[PDB]
Design a protein around this ligand. Structure first.
Ligand SMILES: CCCCCCCCCCCCCCCCCC(=O)OC[C@H](COP(=O)([O-])OCC(O)COP(=O)([O-])OC[C@@H](COC(=O)CCCCCCCCCCCCCCCCC)OC(=O)CCCCCCCCCCCCCCCCC)OC(=O)CCCCCCCCCCCCCCCCC
Ligand SMILES: CCCCCCCCCCCCCCCCCC(=O)OC[C@H](COP(=O)([O-])OCC[N+](C)(C)C)OC(=O)CCCCCCCCCCCCCCCCC
Ligand SMILES: CCCCCCCCCCCCCCCCCC(=O)OC[C@H](COP(=O)(O)OCCN)OC(=O)CCCCCCCCCCCCCCCCC
Ligand SMILES: CCCCCCCCCCCCCCCCCC(=O)OC[C@H](COP(=O)(O)OCCN)OC(=O)CCCCCCCCCCCCCCCCC
Ligand SMILES: CCCCCCCCCCCCCCCCCC(=O)OC[C@H](COP(=O)(O)OCCN)OC(=O)CCCCCCCCCCCCCCCCC
Ligand SMILES: CCCCCCCCCCCCO[C@@H]1O[C@H](CO)[C@@H](O[C@H]2O[C@H](CO)[C@@H](O)[C@H](O)[C@H]2O)[C@H](O)[C@H]1O
Ligand SMILES: CCCCCCCCCCCCO[C@@H]1O[C@H](CO)[C@@H](O[C@H]2O[C@H](CO)[C@@H](O)[C@H](O)[C@H]2O)[C@H](O)[C@H]1O
Ligand SMILES: CCCCCCCCCCCCO[C@@H]1O[C@H](CO)[C@@H](O[C@H]2O[C@H](CO)[C@@H](O)[C@H](O)[C@H]2O)[C@H](O)[C@H]1O
Ligand SMILES: CCCCCCCCCCCCO[C@@H]1O[C@H](CO)[C@@H](O[C@H]2O[C@H](CO)[C@@H](O)[C@H](O)[C@H]2O)[C@H](O)[C@H]1O
Lengths: 51, 170, 459, 98, 62, 126, 606
C-alpha cells in the first residue's frame, strides 16, 4: 500500500541486520568443535555443532 | 526436594500435648479449622495441577564443564590457552561464592533453630564458616574489580613465598 | 550489533519519506520497536562476554547502557514534538535526524571492541549534540554553551588519542579482549603519570569531575529538552563507561594517582549538593545535582572493588532515568510559564494534581529512597568506600542529608505553598506529558524487582 | 528599528480540541500518536519486556553455580575433603623464584 | 546602596537589609502573600535564603 | 536590660530610637517610598485585572534578581587580595585537608594489614 | 507451623490490598475510609492467632520466602522475623491504628482528600510493619526510610501552609542525620561480619562492637527524637491530629527504640554503649519534661510528653533491660494514642482551638472525653495497676537497684515527678474552672465513631498492661528484693509531683501579677535550642552555598584559572600576529633576520 509502505523499512532493517549478524558467524568458525572445553564427536546426522 | 546432607537438619523433637487445665485450647480448634478450610482445598487444587504435570513429563540437565588446563599451564601471552583457563577460573570463582553462601545459610539456620542455646549448640557450624571464609579470603580477597586468574596466581605465589620464608627460619 | 545498527539507520529514510503530518508518529513507533528488540542483549553469561564479531561485543556493562540509550530515543521524540510544532517540516526532519544519528553513534560507542573505534564514536557524538544545542537552543547563550561543551571535551580527548595510539604501538593491540590478557603493570615514572592523565582526563571532563564541571550547567540551561535528556541520561555515562574500561590497563598506578580525584569528588559532591540549595534556575539545579551524583561514580570507579563497580553501574542507570525525568518535569512547567526560575510558579500541586505525583516520585528517587535502584547504587558505593577508608562515611552521610534537603526543597518550592496569583495559563496536563513522565518512572521502579540486570559484569 | 515579525501568542491546544492529547493539532493524528505511544510503550515494551526479563534463562549462571556448589559440598564432605582450600592452583604446578 | 566594590561580583545590585521575609507585615496585601513581596520591588540578594521556610531574623524575647 | 540585636535577631521596631524621632525630612522620604510602591502597584494591577490577559506578568525585578545571581558575577569580579585569599582558603585548602586525613588513615591501615595486626577475619566483601 | 507462617503473612498482605485497589479495579470510593478501617480490624484478628501460638509454646520462626539478590557472598532475601518482638507489637499497633482510623473517619470527615489521607495512614502502617518484621538490615532500612517519608507527607498534609512544609522538611532533616548512623552500622556489619542478617550478626557476636553500636545509637537518636536531634518531634504537631496520634504511639517515634531492642544481644555485652544510651535517655527525659511544664498548646504538651517517655525507654536500654523497654513501647501506645485522640476531641469542639488558656470548664460539658483524658493521664503517670504501671514502675525499680550512673538515675526520677506536673497542667486548665472559650457553644462529643474509638483505647489503657504482663514469657530475672524506699520511689515522687502541681495551678488564680524568671523563659522557649540552632546552622550552611561554593568557586575562580585566561592569551597572541603594516620592506627585513638567526643561533646550515 502506498500509505503504509514506509512501515516496513525498520522491520526489514532488523531482518537484514539479523541476517548479516549470522553471516558474520560463518567467518568465525575456526574453532567450531575444537575448543578444549566443548570439543566432542559429531552425532550421526550432525554436520557441524553450531552455525 | 533438596539434599539433606548439603542442607542438614537435626531430627526434630516435639513434645506431646500435656494439658493441666479444663479450658479448651483455642489453637487446637483453629488448627482443625485451618486444616479443613485452608489446607484441604489447597491440597485439592495442587493435586489437580500435579496430575496435569504428570501427563507432560520432560527433563532438564545440570551442565557439566570438563576441566581444561589452568592459568599455570599457559604460556605467556598465549590468549587461546589463557582464555580457556580464565573462563574456568571465573566459573570456579562463582562456585566458591555459592559454597560460602551454603555455609552461611547453615550457620544462620542453626542460630535460629537452637534459640537461646545457639552459642553452645552451633559451634560446628561456626567453625566450618570460619574455615571456608579463611580459605575464600586467601583465594580471592584484594584482587580488585579487574580480577583474573593471573592476579589470583600472583597472590598465591606471594603467599607461598611468605610461607616458605617463615618455614626456613624455623 | 548490525541487528540494531541497521534498523537505527533505517529510521532516517522512514522520517524523511513519511507523510508530512506523520513524522512524529512514525519515528516514535519504530524507535519503540527497536527498543523492544534491544532486550535480546540480555543473553549474558557468567564467565564470557557476548562477543558478536571483530568489531562489536556486549557484556553486562554495555548492555544496560545500550537499553537505556535505545529507550531514550522515543522518549526524546515525545518530549520535543511540542516546542518544535512551529518549525518548518524540513528542519523538523533534520532535528529528528540528529537524534537518530546520536543513537547510532551511542550504540556503536558502547559496543566497540577496539578502543580507537570507541574513541572515534565517542568523539562523533559531539557533532550532533553540539548542533542540537546551538541550532535549536532558545537563548543567546547557547552559542557560548556550545563552545564550552566542544572545547572542554577536545582539550581532554586529544591527549587521550595520543595515549591510545601509544598503547597500541607498545602492546600491539587496542582490542579490549586482547588487553584483558596482555595487560602489563604500569610502573612508576613521570612518563606513566602523564600516560595515566591522558587516559583519564577526557573521561573525567565528561562525567564531569568537580573542577571540570562548569561546562555542564551551561549546556543544560541552553539546551532544548531532548538535548538535556540525552546529555544527562547517556552522554555523561560515556565518561563512566570509558573509565570502567580503561582502568584495566592502568594498574597499579591508579593506587596513588586516584587520590587527587577522589578528594575532588568526595569534597566536590558536598559542594555541588550545597550549591543546589541556592540555585534559582530549575534546570541549573538539576544540572548541579548530576555533578553530585556522578562524583559518587568517579569515586566508585577509582577505588576498583567489586561492590563499587556494581554500585557505579546501578547509579549510572538509575541517575539516567531520574535526571531525564527531572528535566522533563521542569520542561513541562517551562512550556507553560516560559521561565526556568524555580520561585516563579509556586503551589502547582493545587493546579496540576497528577503532575505533582510525578514530581514527588522523581524527587524520592533523586534522594535515593530504598529500595529504588537509585538507593541500591548509592548504598553499594557507600559500603565499598567505607572499607577504602572509614572516614568517608561522614562525607557520604552529609551528602545524603543535603541531597534530601535540596530534592524536597525543589518539590516544596514549586508544588506546595500558595499558587502565584497572576500566572493564569496553567492548563491541564496533556496525555503526552503524563505518558512521558510514566515512561521514565515505571521502568525505573520495575528494575527494583530484578536489580541484577543493571549491576554490571562484577555481579 | 528593523522590519521583524512580532512574537506570536502561545496557543492553547485545548481551545480548538478539548479532547486533545497534546500530540498534534490534527485530531486524527493526535489520537494515533497517543495510540502508538501507549501501545508500543506500555503494552509491548513494558509488559512483554518485563515478562521477558522475568524469564531470562539463568542470567549469568547464578542458578547453575548454586547447583554446582551443592554438588561439590556434597561430594567433598562425603569424602572428608576440605570444603574449600586456600590454594586456587595446585602448588606442584608452580615453580617459585630462588 | 550597592555592595562594596571588591572582587565578589555583586555589580550594582542593591544591598538591602539582611532581614527575613517572616519579619514583613503579614496583614498588608502583598502581591505575593506567601513570599510577602510586591511585584516590581527589588529582591534581596539572598531572598531564597530568607523565605519563610528558611532563615528567620525576627526579634527574640530573650 | 537593653535589647542587644544580632544578625539572626533584629532589633524590634518599637525599641528603635529612630522610630520616634521623625522629622519632616523623614516623613518626606516615607512619602516618596509609598509613591514608588503605589506606582508599581498600579502598573501591576492594570495587567493583573485585565480580562483579556492570559499568561505571566513578567516582573523585571525577578529577572534582575536571577540575572544578578548568575551571569552578572564574573564581569564584576576582580582578582585581588580578598578574593584570591578566599579563593585559595576554601578552594584548595579542603582538598589538601581531606587528602591528609584519608592518606594518613590508609597508610596506617595498610601498615597494619601487611604486619598482620588488622582483624579481617570475616572480611570477604569489598 | 503452616498455620503460624501462613497467618502471619496474611496479616501483612491484608494491609496491602486497599492500596492495590487504588488501581480502580474493584473500588467503592463512597466509603474508602471504612474499607481501610475494616482491613485493619480484620488484620488485627488474623495477627492474634500467631500471637496466641507464641504465648502458648513460644513458637518463633523466620520466613525467607523470596530470594531477591545475591552480591557474591551476600545473599539478600525478603525475610520476615516472626519472633517475640514482632508477635506482641503487631497486634498492639493494629489495635491502636484501628481506633485511630475509626476516629479519623469523624475527625477528617470534611477533608476533601480524606481518601488520600487514609491511604497515607495505611502506607504509614505498612512501612512500620516492614520495619518491625525485618530480618535483615536492608529490609529494615526500607521500613526505616519509609516511615520517615510517610511522616513527611502527613506532617505537611496542609501543604499551602509554610509552617507545615517547614515542619515536614525538619523531620526529614533530623531523621536523615540519624540515618548516617544507620548506614555506618550497615557498612561495619558487611565489612566485618560479611552480613546484614540478624542471625549471622548474633552468631558471630563481635566483641569490638563500639562502632556499629554508636551508629545504631545515632540512628535511634534521630528517629526517637533524643536530645540533640529532638526538636523535630514537637514541630510535627503541624500535622492533623490523627497523624500525631499514630506518629507518637504505634509507628514513627518508637522505631529508634525498637532498633536498639533488636540488637540487645550486642548491647548487653557493651557497657560503653550502655553508658551512652543511659545518659542520652536521661537528659532527654528530663529536658523535654521540663519543656512541657510551660507549653500552652495542648498538642505540644503531649508531644513533649512523648519525647520524655521515649527518653525513659532509652534509659531502659541503658540499664540493659531491653524487654522492659519493649513492654513500655506496647503500654505507651494505648494511653498516648488516647491522649491525642481526647485532645483532638476538645480541639474539634472548640473550632480548632489548641491553647489550653482558652479551654476550661469542660469537665461536665464533655463527660466522656473527660473520663478518657483522666484515665489516660493516670496511666501515663503510673497510677497502680493501669496499663502504664506494668512497665514504668518495673523500669524505675530496675534503674533504682542497678549499677548505674548516679546522675542519670536522679534525672530520671525528677522527670517522673515532672510527668505528674504537666499532666496536672492539662487536666487543670482544660477541664476544671470556668469556661474561657468563645460564646457560641458548639461542644458535641456524641458521634459514635468518636466514642467507640476512644472507648476501645480506654479499655486498653486499663487492662492491656495487665493482660500483656501476665502472658509474655520471662526472659530476665526481675529484681524483687530492695529497700522500701527504692520500691516506692516512683509512687512517691509522682504523688509529690501532683501535690506540687496543684500549688502552682491554684496560684494562677490569685490577684497577683508576676514577672517571668529565666527558668520560665528557658522552659517556654525550649531551652532556646530551636531558636539558636534553627537560625544559626541554616544560615551558615545556606551562606556557604551561595557565597563560596557557587559564586566564589564555580562562577569565578574555576572560570578564571582556565577558560577565561586561556581565551585572553590567544586573543592577545592573535593581535600580535595579524597587526602588520602590509609593507614589503618590513616583511623582507624579517626574512633577513630569520636567515641570520637560523645560522648564527641554531646552525641550521650545518
Ligand atoms: C507487567 C508490567 C507492569 C506495568 C507496571 C504496572 C504498575 C503501574 C500501575 C499503572 C496503573 C496506575 C493507576 O491507574 O493507579 C492510579 C492511581 C490512583 O488514582 P488517583 O487517586 O486518581 O491518583 C491521583 C494522584 O496521582 C494520586 O496521588 P497520591 O499522593 O494519592 O498517591 C500516589 C502515590 C504513588 O503511588 C504509589 O507509589 C503507591 C505507594 C507505594 C506502594 O504516592 C505516594 O503515596 C508516595 C509514597 C511513597 C513512600 C511509600 C513507602 C516506600 C515503601 C516502598 C515499599 C517497597 C516494597 C517493600 O494514581 C496514581 O498513583 C498515579 C501514579 C501511578 C504510578 C505509581 C507507581 C506504581 C508502580
Ligand atoms: C511482586 C511482583 C512479582 C514479581 O516479582 O515479578 C517477577 C519478576 C521478579 O521475580 P523473579 O526474579 O523471581 O522472576 C520470576 C520468574 N521466575 C520465577 C521464573 C524466576 O519480575 C521481574 O523480573 C520484572 C523485571 C522488570 C525489569 C525490566 C523493566 C522493563 C524494561 C524496559 C526497558 C526500557 C527501560 C529502560 C531500562 C534501562 C536499562 C535496563
Ligand atoms: C598545550 C601545550 C602543551 C602540549 C603538551 C606538552 C607535552 C606533555 C608531554 C608529557 C610527557 C609525555 C612523554 O613525552 O612521554 C614520552 C615517553 C616516550 O618514551 P618511550 O620510549 O616510548 O617509553 C619509555 C618512557 N620514557 O613516554 C610516553 O610516551 C608516555 C606518554 C603517553 C602519551 C602521553 C599523552 C600526552 C600526555 C600529556 C597530556 C596529559 C594531561 C592531559 C590534561 C588534559 C586536561 C583536560
Ligand atoms: C554528623 C554530620 C551532620 C551534618 C548535619 C548537616 C545539617 C545541615 C544544616 C541544615 C541546612 C539547612 C537547610 C535549609 C532548611 C531550613 O532552613 O529550615 C529552617 C528550619 C526552621 O524551622 P523552625 O525553627 O521550626 O521555624 C518554623 C516556623 N517559622 O530549621 C530547620 O528545620 C533546620 C534545623 C536543623 C539544624 C541542624 C542541627 C543539627 C544538630 C546536630 C547536633 C546533634 C548531634 C548528634 C546528636 C547528639 C548526640 C546524641
Ligand atoms: C531484602 C529484600 C528486599 C526486597 C526489595 C524489593 C521489594 C520488591 C517488592 C516485594 C514483593 C513482595 C512479593 C515477593 C514475591 C514476588 C515474586 C515471586 O513470588 O515469584 C518469584 C519466586 C521465585 O522463587 P525465588 O527463588 O525466591 O526467586 C529467585 C529469583 N529472584 O516464585 C516462586 O517461588 C513461586 C512462584 C509461583 C507462585 C504460585 C502461587 C500462585 C498463586 C496464584 C497467583 C496469585
Ligand atoms: C511491525 C511494524 C509496526 C509499525 C506500526 C506503525 C503504526 C502507524 C500508525 C499509522 C496511523 C494510520 O494512518 C492513517 O490511517 C488511515 C486509515 O488507514 C489512512 O486513511 C485515512 O484517509 C482518510 C482520512 O484523511 C479517511 O478515508 C480515513 O480517515 C482513512 O481511510 C490515512 O491515510 C493514514 O494516514
Ligand atoms: C539509479 C540511481 C537512482 C536510484 C533512485 C531510486 C529511488 C528513485 C525514487 C523516485 C521517486 C521519488 O519520489 C519523489 O520524492 C518524494 C518521495 O516519493 C515525493 O514527495 C514526497 O513529499 C513529502 C515528503 O517530502 C511526502 O508527502 C512524501 O514523502 C512524498 O509525497 C515526490 O512527490 C516524488 O516525486
Ligand atoms: C581544562 C580542560 C578544558 C579547558 C577548556 C578551555 C578552552 C576554552 C573554553 C571556552 C572557549 C570559548 O571561547 C570564548 O571564551 C570567552 C570567555 O572565555 C567568551 O566570552 C565570554 O566571556 C568573556 C570574558 O568574561 C566576555 O568578555 C564575553 O562577553 C563573553 O561572551 C567568548 O564569547 C568565547 O568565544
Ligand atoms: C587545555 C588547552 C585548550 C586549548 C583550547 C583553545 C581554545 C581557543 C578559544 C578561542 C580563543 C579566542 O577567543 C576569543 O577570546 C577573547 C578573550 O576571551 C574573547 O573576547 C571577549 O572576552 C574579553 C575578556 O573580557 C573581552 O574583553 C572582549 O570584549 C570579549 O569579546 C573573544 O570573544 C573570543 O572570540
Amino acid at each position: 500500500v502506498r500509505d503504509h509502505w514506509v512501515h516496513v523499512l525498520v522491520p526489514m532493517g532488523f531482518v537484514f541486520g539479523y541476517y548479516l549478524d549470522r553471516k558474520n558467524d560463518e567467518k568465525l568458525t575456526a574453532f567450531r568443535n575444537k575448543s578444549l572445553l566443548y570439543k566432542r564427536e559429531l552425532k550421526p546426522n550432525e554436520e557441524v555443532t553450531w552455525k | 526436594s533438596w539434599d539433606k546432607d548439603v542442607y542438614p537438619e537435626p531430627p526434630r523433637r516435639t513434645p506431646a500435648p500435656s494439658p493441666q487445665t479444663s479450658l479448651p485450647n483455642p489453637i487446637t480448634y483453629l488448627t482443625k479449622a485451618f486444616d479443613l478450610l485452608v489446607d484441604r482445598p489447597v491440597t485439592l487444587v495442587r493435586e489437580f495441577i500435579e496430575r496435569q504435570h504428570a501427563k507432560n513429563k520432560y527433563y532438564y540437565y545440570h551442565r557439566e564443564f570438563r576441566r581444561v588446563p589452568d592459568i599455570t599451564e599457559c604460556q605467556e601471552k598465549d590468549v587461546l590457552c589463557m582464555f580457556e583457563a580464565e573462563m574456568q577460573w571465573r566459573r570456579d570463582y562463582k562456585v566458591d561464592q555459592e559454597i560460602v553462601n551454603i555455609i552461611q545459610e547453615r550457620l544462620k539456620a542453626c542460630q535460629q533453630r537452637e534459640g537461646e542455646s545457639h552459642r553452645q549448640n552451633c559451634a560446628k557450624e561456626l567453625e566450618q564458616f570460619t574455615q571456608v571464609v579463611k580459605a575464600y579470603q586467601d583465594r580471592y580477597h584484594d584482587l580488585g574489580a579487574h580480577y583474573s586468574a593471573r592476579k589470583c596466581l600472583a597472590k598465591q605465589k606471594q603467599r607461598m613465598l611468605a610461607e616458605r620464608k617463615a618455614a626456613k627460619e624455623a | 550489533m548490525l541487528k540494531y545498527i541497521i534498523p537505527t539507520i533505517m529510521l532516517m529514510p522512514l522520517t524523511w519519506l513519511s507523510k508530512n503530518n506523520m513524522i512524529w508518529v512514525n519515528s516514535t513507533a519504530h524507535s519503540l520497536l527497536i527498543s523492544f528488540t534491544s532486550l535480546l542483549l540480555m543473553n549474558q553469561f557468567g564467565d564470557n562476554s557476548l562477543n558478536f564479531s571483530l568489531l562489536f561485543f556486549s557484556d553486562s556493562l554495555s548492555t544496560p547502557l545500550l537499553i537505556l540509550t535505545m529507550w531514550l530515543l522515543p522518549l526524546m521524540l515525545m518530549a520535543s514534538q511540542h516546542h518544535l510544532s512551529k518549525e518548518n517540516l524540513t528542519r523538523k526532519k533534520l532535528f529528528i535526524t540528529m537524534l537518530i544519528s546520536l543513537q547510532l553513534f551511542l550504540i556503536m560507542t558502547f559496543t566497540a571492541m577496539e578502543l580507537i573505534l570507541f574513541y572515534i564514536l565517542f568523539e562523533a557524538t559531539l557533532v550532533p549534540t553540539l548542533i542540537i544545542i546551538t541550532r535549536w537552543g532558545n537563548q543567546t547563550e547557547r552559542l557560548n554553551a556550545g563552545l564550552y561543551f566542544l572545547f572542554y571535551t577536545l582539550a581532554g580527548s586529544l591527549p587521550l588519542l595520543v595515549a591510545l595510539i601509544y598503547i597500541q604501538n607498545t602492546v600491539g593491540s587496542l582490542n579490549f579482549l586482547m588487553l584483558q590478557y596482555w595487560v602489563q603493570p604500569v610502573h612508576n615514572s613521570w612518563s606513566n603519570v602523564f600516560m595515566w592523565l591522558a587516559c583519564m582526563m577526557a573521561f573525567m571532563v565528561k562525567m564531569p569531575l568537580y573542577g571540570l564541571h562548569l561546562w555542564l550547567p551551561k549546556a543544560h540551561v541552553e539546551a532544548p529538552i531532548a538535548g538535556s535528556m540525552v546529555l544527562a541520561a547517556v552522554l555523561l555515562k560515556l565518561g563512566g563507561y570509558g573509565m570502567l574500561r580503561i582502568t584495566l590497563i592502568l594498574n597499579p598506578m591508579t593506587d596513588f594517582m586516584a587520590y587527587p580525584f577522589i578528594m575532588l569528588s568526595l569534597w566536590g559532591m558536598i559542594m555541588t549538593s550545597s550549591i543546589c540549595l541556592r540555585q534559582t534556575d530549575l534546570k541549573s539545579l538539576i544540572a548541579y545535582s548530576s555533578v553530585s551524583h556522578m562524583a559518587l561514580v568517579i569515586v566508585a570507579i577509582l577505588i576498583q572493588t567489586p561492590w563499587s563497580y556494581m554500585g557505579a553501574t546501578a547509579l549510572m542507570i538509575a541517575h539516567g532515568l531520574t535526571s531525564s525525568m527531572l528535566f522533563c518535569l521542569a520542561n513541562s512547567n517551562y512550556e507553560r510559564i516560559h521561565s526556568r526560575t524555580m520561585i516563579l510558579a509556586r503551589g502547582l500541586q493545587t493546579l496540576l494534581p497528577l503532575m505533582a505525583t510525578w514530581w514527588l516520585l522523581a524527587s524520592l528517587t533523586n534522594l535515593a529512597l530504598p529500595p529504588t535502584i537509585n538507593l541500591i547504587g548509592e548504598l553499594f558505593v557507600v559500603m565499598s568506600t567505607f572499607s577504602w577508608s572509614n572516614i568517608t562515611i561522614i562525607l557520604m552521610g552529609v551528602n545524603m542529608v543535603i541531597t534530601a534537603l535540596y530534592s524536597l526543597y525543589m518539590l516544596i518550592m514549586t508544588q506546595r505553598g500558595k499558587y502565584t496569583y497572576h500566572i493564569n495559563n496553567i492548563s491541564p496536563s496533556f496525555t503526552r506529558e503524563n505518558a512521558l513522565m510514566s515512561l521514565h518512572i515505571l521502568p525505573l521502579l520495575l528494575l527494583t524487582l530484578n536489580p541484577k540486570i543493571i549491576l554490571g559484569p562484577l555481579y | 528599528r528593523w522590519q521583524e515579525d512580532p512574537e506570536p501568542e502561545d496557543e492553547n491546544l485545548y481551545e480548538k480540541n478539548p479532547d486533545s492529547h497534546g500530540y498534534d493539532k490534527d485530531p486524527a493524528v493526535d489520537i494515533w500518536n497517543m495510540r502508538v505511544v501507549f501501545f508500543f510503550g506500555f503494552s509491548i515494551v513494558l509488559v512483554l519486556g518485563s515478562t521477558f526479563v522475568a524469564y531470562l534463562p539463568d542470567y549469568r549462571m547464578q542458578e547453575w553455580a548454586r547447583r554446582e556448589a551443592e554438588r561439590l559440598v556434597k561430594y567433598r564432605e562425603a569424602h572428608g575433603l576440605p570444603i574449600m582450600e586456600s590454594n586456587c592452583f595446585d602448588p606442584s604446578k608452580i615453580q617459585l623464584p630462588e | 546602596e550597592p555592595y562594596p566594590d571588591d572582587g565578589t561580583g555583586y555589580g550594582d545590585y542593591p544591598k538591602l537589609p539582611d532581614r527575613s521575609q517572616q519579619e514583613r507585615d503579614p496583614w498588608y496585601d502583598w502581591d505575593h502573600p506567601d513570599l510577602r513581596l510586591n511585584w516590581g520591588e527589588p529582591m534581596h540578594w539572598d531572598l531564597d535564603m530568607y523565605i519563610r521556610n528558611r532563615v528567620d531574623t525576627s526579634p527574640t524575647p530573650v | 536590660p537593653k535589647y542587644e540585636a544580632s544578625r539572626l535577631s533584629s532589633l524590634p521596631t518599637t525599641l528603635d530610637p529612630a522610630e520616634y524621632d521623625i522629622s519632616s525630612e523623614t516623613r518626606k522620604a516615607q512619602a516618596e517610598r509609598l509613591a514608588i510602591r503605589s506606582r508599581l502597584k498600579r502598573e501591576y494591577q492594570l495587567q493583573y485585572y485585565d480580562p483579556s490577559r492570559r499568561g505571566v506578568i513578567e516582573d523585571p525585578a525577578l529577572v534582575r534578581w536571577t540575572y544578578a545571581r548568575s551571569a552578572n558575577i564574573y564581569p564584576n569580579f576582580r582578582p585581588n587580595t580578598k578574593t584570591s585569599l578566599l579563593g585559595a582558603l576554601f578552594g584548595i585548602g579542603p582538598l589538601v585537608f581531606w587528602y591528609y586525613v584519608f592518606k594518613t588513615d590508609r597508610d596506617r591501615k595498610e601498615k597494619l594489614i601487611q604486619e598482620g595486626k588488622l582483624d579481617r577475619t570475616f572480611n570477604i566483601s569489598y | 507451623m503452616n498455620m503460624f507462617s501462613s497467618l502471619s503473612l496474611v496479616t501483612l498482605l491484608l494491609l496491602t490490598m486497599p492500596i492495590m485497589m487504588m488501581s480502580f479495579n474493584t473500588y467503592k470510593p463512597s466509603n474508602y475510609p471504612l474499607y481501610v478501617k475494616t482491613a485493619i480490624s480484620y488484620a488485627f484478628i488474623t495477627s492474634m492467632i500467631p500471637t496466641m501460638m507464641f504465648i502458648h509454646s513460644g513458637q518463633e520462626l523466620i520466613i525467607s520466602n523470596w530470594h531477591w539478590l545475591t552480591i557474591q557472598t551476600l545473599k539478600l532475601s525478603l525475610s520476615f522475623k516472626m519472633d517475640y518482638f514482632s508477635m506482641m507489637f503487631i497486634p498492639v499497633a493494629l489495635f491502636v491504628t484501628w481506633s485511630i482510623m475509626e476516629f479519623s473517619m469523624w475527625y477528617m470527615y470534611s477533608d476533601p482528600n480524606i481518601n488520600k489521607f487514609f491511604k497515607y495512614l495505611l502506607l504509614f502502617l505498612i512501612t512500620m510493619l516492614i520495619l518491625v518484621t525485618a530480618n535483615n538490615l536492608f529490609q529494615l532500612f526500607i521500613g526505616w526510610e519509609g516511615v520517615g517519608i510517610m511522616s513527611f507527607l502527613l506532617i505537611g498534609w496542609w501543604y499551602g501552609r509554610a509552617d507545615a512544609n517547614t515542619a515536614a522538611l525538619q523531620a526529614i532533616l533530623y531523621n536523615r542525620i540519624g540515618d548516617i548512623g544507620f548506614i555506618l552500622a550497615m557498612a561495619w556489619f558487611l565489612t566485618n561480619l560479611n552480613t546484614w542478617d540478624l542471625q549471622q550478626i548474633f552468631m558471630l557476636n563481635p566483641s569490638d562492637s563500639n562502632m556499629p553500636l554508636i551508629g545504631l545509637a545515632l540512628a535511634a537518636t534521630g528517629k526517637s527524637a533524643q536530645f540533640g536531634l529532638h526538636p523535630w518531634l514537637p514541630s510535627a504537631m503541624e500535622g492533623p491530629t490523627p497523624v500525631s496520634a499514630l506518629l507518637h504511639s504505634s509507628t514513627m517515634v518508637v522505631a529508634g527504640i525498637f532498633l536498639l531492642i533488636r540488637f540487645y544481644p550486642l548491647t548487653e555485652n557493651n557497657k560503653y554503649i550502655q553508658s551512652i544510651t543511659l545518659c542520652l535517655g536521661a537528659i532527654t527525659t528530663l529536658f523535654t519534661a521540663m519543656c512541657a511544664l510551660t507549653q500552652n498548646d495542648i498538642k505540644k504538651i503531649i508531644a513533649f510528653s512523648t519525647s520524655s517517655q521515649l527518653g525513659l525507654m532509652m534509659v531502659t536500654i541503658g540499664i540493659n533491660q531491653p524487654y522492659l523497654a519493649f513492654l513500655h513501647i506496647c503500654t505507651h501506645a494505648f494511653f498516648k494514642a488516647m491522649l491525642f485522640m481526647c485532645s483532638g476531641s476538645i480541639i474539634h469542639s472548640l473550632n480548632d482551638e489548641q491553647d489550653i488558656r482558652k479551654m476550661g470548664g469542660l469537665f461536665k460539658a464533655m463527660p466522656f472525653t473527660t473520663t478518657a483524658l483522666i484515665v489516660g493521664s493516670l496511666a501515663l503517670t503510673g497510677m497502680p495497676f493501669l496499663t502504664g504501671f506494668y512497665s514504668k514502675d518495673l523500669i524505675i525499680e530496675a534503674a533504682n537497684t542497678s549499677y548505674t550512673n548516679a546522675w542519670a538515675l536522679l534525672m530520671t526520677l525528677i522527670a517522673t515527678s515532672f510527668t505528674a506536673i504537666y499532666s496536672t497542667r492539662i487536666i487543670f486548665f482544660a477541664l476544671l474552672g470556668q469556661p474561657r472559650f468563645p460564646t457560641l457553644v458548639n461542644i458535641n462529643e456524641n458521634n459514635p465513631l468518636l466514642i467507640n474509638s476512644i472507648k476501645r483505647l480506654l479499655i486498653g489503657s486499663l487492662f492491656a498492661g495487665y493482660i500483656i504482663s501476665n502472658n509474655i514469657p520471662p526472659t530476665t530475672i526481675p529484681q524483687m528484693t530492695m529497700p522500701y524506699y527504692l520500691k516506692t520511689t516512683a509512687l512517691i515522687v509522682t504523688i509529690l509531683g501532683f501535690i506540687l502541681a496543684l500549688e502552682i495551678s491554684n496560684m494562677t488564680k490569685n490577684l497577683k501579677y508576676h514577672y517571668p524568671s529565666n527558668a520560665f523563659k528557658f522552659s517556654t522557649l525550649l531551652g532556646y535550642f530551636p531558636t539558636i540552632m534553627h537560625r544559626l546552622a541554616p544560615y551558615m550552611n545556606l551562606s556557604m552555598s551561595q557565597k563560596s561554593a557557587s559564586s566564589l568557586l564555580d562562577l569565578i575562580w574555576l572560570e578564571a584559572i582556565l577558560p577565561k585566561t586561556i581565551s585572553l592569551a590567544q586573543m592577545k597572541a592573535s593581535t600580535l600576529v595579524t597587526n602588520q603594516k602590509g609593507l614589503i620592506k618590513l616583511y623582507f627585513l624579517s626574512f633577513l633576520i630569520t636567515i641570520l638567526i637560523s645560522m648564527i643561533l641554531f646552525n641550521f646550515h650545518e
